[PDB]
């Protein structure tokens, strides 16, 4: 019934290590007692807990030129439009109207797709570099 019992169970099961029990109690407090907790290696001396919030997936951007924040080599937008598709965006005509809405409403656009072929990618990079369109594939 209490997180103290959770910490005690995780401490006993980890051969008396109180820090492992405390970190498991913190993880179960953050993501829930039925949440997803994954153990992996660390490059530091001490154990650490990282809480990943929202929808984070293992895919980076397609084009390196989309970086608008070079402080950490990342693309950063606030209040952005999202265009989602399971088909690879290749043609010009399949990418112009979404850019038209994103330019008319003056909002960033994140295009999550299976892939982006050379024609649509060249259009996106040319609009990002030349006129300064806030887009990321």
């Amino acid at each position: 019934t209490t997180p103290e019992e959770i910490a005690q169970v995780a401490t006993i099961s980890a051969n008396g290590d109180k820090e492992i029990g405390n970190i498991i109690s913190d993880a179960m407090k953050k993501v829930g007692r039925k949440g997803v907790i994954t153990v992996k290696d660390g490059k530091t001396l001490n154990d650490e807990l990282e809480i990943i919030e929202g929808m984070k997936f293992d895919r980076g951007y397609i084009s390196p030129y989309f970086i608008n924040t070079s402080k950490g080599q990342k693309c950063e937008f606030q209040d952005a439009y999202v265009l989602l598709s399971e088909k690879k965006i290749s043609s010009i005509q399949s990418i112009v109207p979404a850019l038209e809405i994103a330019n008319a409403h003056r909002k960033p656009l994140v295009i999550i797709a299976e892939d982006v072929d050379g024609e649509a990618l060249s259009t996106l990079v040319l609009n990002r570099l030349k006129v300064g369109l806030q887009v990321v594939a």
Binding site: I92, L99, E119, T123, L126, V131, L133
Partner: protein
């Protein structure tokens, strides 16, 4: 026939200048220059004398100088006049002209 920049086509051949390729959309999205292809809209800058399909008289060309026309995707010959590109077609190869 009518000669344009010291060049007059022979028979029913028509020399046209292709229209400028569209670089921006109506909303303001830039287009890459490699994906434009060839412009099918042209303006007639030179006409020939005409063919001889019927004996006796010589048939004039249907189009005239200064007529906007629609080109087929094939059938053009590149002519370099004053280091500028022009296209030679036939009179029958022209699809249709824009009247106003």
């Amino acid at each position: 026939g009518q000669a344009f920049r010291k060049f007059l086509p022979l028979f029913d051949r028509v020399l046209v200048e292709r229209s400028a390729a569209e670089t921006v959309t109506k909303g303001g999205i830039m287009l890459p220059e490699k994906s434009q292809g060839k412009v099918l809209q042209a303006t007639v800058v030179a006409v020939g004398s005409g063919s001889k399909g019927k004996g006796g008289e010589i048939q004039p060309v249907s189009v005239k100088v200064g007529d906007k026309v629609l080109l087929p995707e094939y059938g053009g010959t590149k002519v370099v006049l004053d280091d500028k590109d022009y296209f030679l077609f036939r009179d029958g190869d022209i699809l249709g002209k824009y009247v106003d």
